[PDB]
RNA sequence: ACCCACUCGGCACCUUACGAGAAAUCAAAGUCUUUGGGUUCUGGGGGGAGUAUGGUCGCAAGGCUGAAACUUAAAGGAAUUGACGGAAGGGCACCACCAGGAGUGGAGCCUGCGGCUUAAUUUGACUCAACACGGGGAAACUCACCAGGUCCAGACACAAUAAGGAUUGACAGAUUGAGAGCUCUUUCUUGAUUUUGUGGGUGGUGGUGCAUGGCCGUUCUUAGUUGGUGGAGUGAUUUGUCUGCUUAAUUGCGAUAACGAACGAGACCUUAACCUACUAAAUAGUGGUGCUAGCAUUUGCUGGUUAUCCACUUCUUAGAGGGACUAUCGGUUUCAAGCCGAUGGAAGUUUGAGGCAAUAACAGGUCUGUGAUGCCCUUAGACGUUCUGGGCCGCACGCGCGCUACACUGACGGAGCCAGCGAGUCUAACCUUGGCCGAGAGGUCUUGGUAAUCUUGUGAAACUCCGUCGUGCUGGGGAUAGAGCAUUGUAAUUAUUGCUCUUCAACGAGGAAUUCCUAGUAAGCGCAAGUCAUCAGCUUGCGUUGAUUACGUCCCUGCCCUUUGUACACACC
C-alpha cells in the first residue's frame, strides 16, 4: 500500500568522542603525583571517580546522574 | 486425537478415531445400547408321567 | 353378413432367446475362427471438403462425377454412474401458507451496515446462509486508523572498530506534549556485555481464508450411506435400496430374486415431570417439648426461641432404585405396520426440552484467537514495540435488529406483595446485611459469608386493591435542551453513568410490503448471569402472568424423492 513521506531531518545518535581520556594527573620529576579534578564523595563511588567541571557544576558520573556537588 | 503436522508446503490435519472393543470395556458399560443378547433355551424330553422321589 | 377350423399370400403385434451383438437391441442384425448358397453397391482415424480442378447435365438455381496440399490424437458408438434442466409425477415444513396471535415496516430514540464527510473516520462479512455478527457495550488501554516522540527486545557466525579504549549512561540548560540525555551545548561516567559490516535470524492485527491445519456456518426442522452371499450384466454397474401402505425417520408393514447385516435414525445421554417406599442431613426442614410476648382469658390464636432437649424425613437436598410399554378397552385400516377416542395414569405430541449426529458438497467464513502455518511483503526513516493525543460515535441521506410510545384492559399516588436459573473477598479490596447522615443520587461506621452456612425469602416486575385525573397531542408520550448535585477512573469536553428541577417535539394504530410462532406455547413482565474500572436499548439462561387459533394443506415460497433428457463430468459459475 502507501509509502514513504519525509519532512527530512534524519537524526543520528550519541557521539561519545574519543581523545585519550586520562592525562589528568600531574607527575613531578622524581617521582610524586598530584591529582587534578577532585573525586567524588558518595559511598557507592570509589575515590577514583572524579567530578566533571563545567560551570556551577562538579558532578559525579559513576553514580549515573547522581549528586552534582558544586565547588 | 488430532494433530497439526508441518511440512514444507504447509500443514496437514491428522484426525484419528479409534474404536476399542465394547465387550472389553472393563470399568464401564461393556456393550452398545444396540446390543440385545438372547439366552438360548434347553431341549425338553416330554411326558415322564407323574412320579415322585422320596428323600 | 356372422362363427369355427385348416391353408396359401400380406400390413403389423406379443413372448421369448437355441443363437447374435460393443451395447441399445435383432426371427434377423440368427445358421462367423466349427470362417464359402448367388449376386449388386458402399466404407478403411478426425478434419481439410463434398472444397479445388476437369468432364458433363441444366434456362437458372443447381445435379453428377471429384482430388490434394496441409493439418491433427483423437473424433466417434452403445451403455454406466453422477451433476444439471426455464420436463413431468409424488411428497415434506409456521426458517411454507391455511386459521388466527403478537408485531416489524409509519413515529421518537438505541444500535449495526451503506453512503457522505474526514489528517483518521482501522478492518472482516452482503440472499436465506451479511446488517445487537466477529462475543466488536473502543473515553487511555483494546488499536489494526491519523498527527508526532523513544526503543532493539537485529539470536547466532564471519569480518572489522578496539584495552593508547569496542561500547553504556548521564546531572543542569537548549530542546520537547513530556522531569524522553530523543538530540545538542559541557565532561564526567562505563569496560569487551556492545558497535560498523556481510551473512543469517527474528517480530508483525502487513498480504494471501483463492496456498493450508484447526475450528465453524449451510445443504440438514434432511434422511440418507455401505458391504456378505445369492439373481442380472462381457463390463462400468445393478438388484438388496421397491407399486402401495405407514412413521418424525431407508421407521416399519407389506410386495418381492432376493435373503440376512452394518453406519446414520432409533437406542444412547442431559435436564424436566412421579415416589407419605429405601439410605440420610444444625449448611434442609416438619412435629413435640421446654423458654417467652400479645390478644382472648375455658383449653385457645399468632409470633419471638445461640441447639434447651425429644422425635422425625411429608416439604428439601442427592445417593440408590422403581414407573410408560402409547398399557386397558372400543373404533379403523391390505383387520398388517399403524392411526383414532374414551378409561386408567406423575406423565400417552419421539412423555416435553435439549445433547450427540453417517457419507458428501462450498474455492461459504475465519492468517484480526493462537508461540497453528506455506509463500510474498516489511524488518531499524519498522508495517516491529512503546509514549502523547485524536479517531472508530465523525452527519444532506439509504437499509437492518431493537427500545420507548400513541393511553381509560391507561398514566399517576399510596397499598397488598409473589419466583427461579445465578454469582460472589486472599496476597484480597469482591457478594454485602445492619445502623447512622443525605430529597434523590449517594457517603460513612460496622457485619457475616471461599458460601445449601452470610448477602437471599435476592419482599423482581408485570400484577391485585383504594383512590387522584376524565378524554381534551390530556395529568398519554418523553425526544430535545438548560442549570445544579453525585458516582467510575490518571483522565469524562465530543457531554461513561445516576439524581433534582425546568424544557414537553414527534407519535391520533402506521402505505407497498414483511418476520416469529401451536400449549405453560405465543405474547406481556422482570431477574440473573456473559461483557465490566465505569457503561445494556444486546446476548445466554430463568422464573412470574398466561391466551386467540390449527390437528389441516400443496396455492405462493423453499427443499427431498423418483421418472425423464443431455453434446456437462473442472459437472449450468
Ligand atoms: Mg428386418
Ligand atoms: Mg457416400
Ligand atoms: Mg488423413
Ligand atoms: Mg457426394
Ligand atoms: Mg466427407
Ligand atoms: Mg451433395
Ligand atoms: Mg465442377
Ligand atoms: Mg438432354
Ligand atoms: Mg453447358
Ligand atoms: Mg397470515
Ligand atoms: Mg440478532
Ligand atoms: Mg455484542
Ligand atoms: Mg483507543
Ligand atoms: Mg501493531
Ligand atoms: Mg474457504
Ligand atoms: Mg472468498
Ligand atoms: Mg456378486
Ligand atoms: Mg452384490
Ligand atoms: Mg443401489
Ligand atoms: Mg446405529
Ligand atoms: Mg427427543
Ligand atoms: Mg495511543
Ligand atoms: Mg463499529
Ligand atoms: Mg430462590
Ligand atoms: Mg437465599
Ligand atoms: Mg409524564
Ligand atoms: Mg417468510
Ligand atoms: Mg460489577
Ligand atoms: Mg461482578
Ligand atoms: Mg462506552
Ligand atoms: Mg466431456
Ligand atoms: Mg451460462
Ligand atoms: Zn556519585
From Swiss-Prot, chain A:
Modified positions (Phosphoserine) in chain numbering: 41
Subcellular location: Cytoplasm
ZnF (C4-type) residues: 40-63
Domain of life of the organism encoding this protein: Eukaryota
Residues in cross-link Glycyl lysine isopeptide (Lys-Gly) (interchain with G-Cter in ubiquitin): 26, 32
Described purpose of this protein according to its UniProt entry: Component of the ribosome, a large ribonucleoprotein complex responsible for the synthesis of proteins in the cell. The small ribosomal subunit (SSU) binds messenger RNAs (mRNAs) and translates the encoded message by selecting cognate aminoacyl-transfer RNA (tRNA) molecules. The large subunit (LSU) contains the ribosomal catalytic site termed the peptidyl transferase center (PTC), which catalyzes the formation of peptide bonds, thereby polymerizing the amino acids delivered by tRNAs into a polypeptide chain.
Self-association and partners: Component of the small ribosomal subunit (SSU). Mature yeast ribosomes consist of a small (40S) and a large (60S) subunit. The 40S small subunit contains 1 molecule of ribosomal RNA (18S rRNA) and 33 different proteins (encoded by 57 genes). The large 60S subunit contains 3 rRNA molecules (25S, 5.8S and 5S rRNA) and 46 different proteins (encoded by 81 genes).
Identification of the protein by name: Small ribosomal subunit protein eS31
From Swiss-Prot, chain B:
Residues modified as Phosphoserine: 51
Annotated gene: RPS3
Cross-link Glycyl lysine isopeptide (Lys-Gly) (interchain with G-Cter in ubiquitin): residue positions: 30, 42
More details: Present with 146000 molecules/cell in log phase SD medium.
Subunit structure: Component of the small ribosomal subunit (SSU). Mature yeast ribosomes consist of a small (40S) and a large (60S) subunit. The 40S small subunit contains 1 molecule of ribosomal RNA (18S rRNA) and 33 different proteins (encoded by 57 genes). The large 60S subunit contains 3 rRNA molecules (25S, 5.8S and 5S rRNA) and 46 different proteins (encoded by 81 genes).
Protein name: Small ribosomal subunit protein uS3
Covalent S-S links between cysteines: none
Organism of this sequence: Saccharomyces cerevisiae (strain ATCC 204508 / S288c)
Subcellular location: Cytoplasm
Family to which this protein belongs: Belongs to the universal ribosomal protein uS3 family.
Function: Component of the ribosome, a large ribonucleoprotein complex responsible for the synthesis of proteins in the cell. The small ribosomal subunit (SSU) binds messenger RNAs (mRNAs) and translates the encoded message by selecting cognate aminoacyl-transfer RNA (tRNA) molecules. The large subunit (LSU) contains the ribosomal catalytic site termed the peptidyl transferase center (PTC), which catalyzes the formation of peptide bonds, thereby polymerizing the amino acids delivered by tRNAs into a polypeptide chain.
Maturation and modification: Ubiquitinated at Lys-42 in response to stalled ribosomes. Ubiquitination leads to activation of the No-Go Decay (NGD) pathway and degradation of non-functional 18S rRNA: first monoubiquitinated at Lys-42 by MAG2, followed by formation of 'Lys-63'-linked polyubiquitin chains on monoubiquitin by HEL2 and RSP5.
Amino acid at each position: 500500500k502507501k509509502v514513504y513521506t519525509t519532512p527530512k531531518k534524519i537524526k543520528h545518535k550519541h557521539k561519545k568522542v574519543k581523545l585519550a581520556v586520562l592525562s589528568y594527573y600531574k607527575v613531578d620529576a622524581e617521582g610524586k603525583v598530584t591529582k587534578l579534578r577532585r573525586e567524588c564523595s558518595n559511598p557507592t563511588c570509589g575515590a577514583g571517580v572524579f567530578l566533571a567541571n563545567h560551570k556551577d557544576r562538579l558532578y559525579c558520573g559513576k553514580c549515573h546522574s547522581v549528586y552534582k556537588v558544586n565547588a | 486425537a488430532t494433530r497439526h503436522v508441518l511440512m514444507r508446503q504447509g500443514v496437514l490435519g491428522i484426525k484419528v478415531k479409534i474404536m476399542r472393543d465394547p465387550a472389553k470395556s472393563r470399568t464401564g458399560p461393556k456393550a452398545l445400547p444396540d446390543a440385545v443378547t438372547i439366552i438360548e433355551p434347553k431341549e425338553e424330553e416330554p411326558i415322564l408321567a407323574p412320579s415322585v422321589k422320596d428323600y
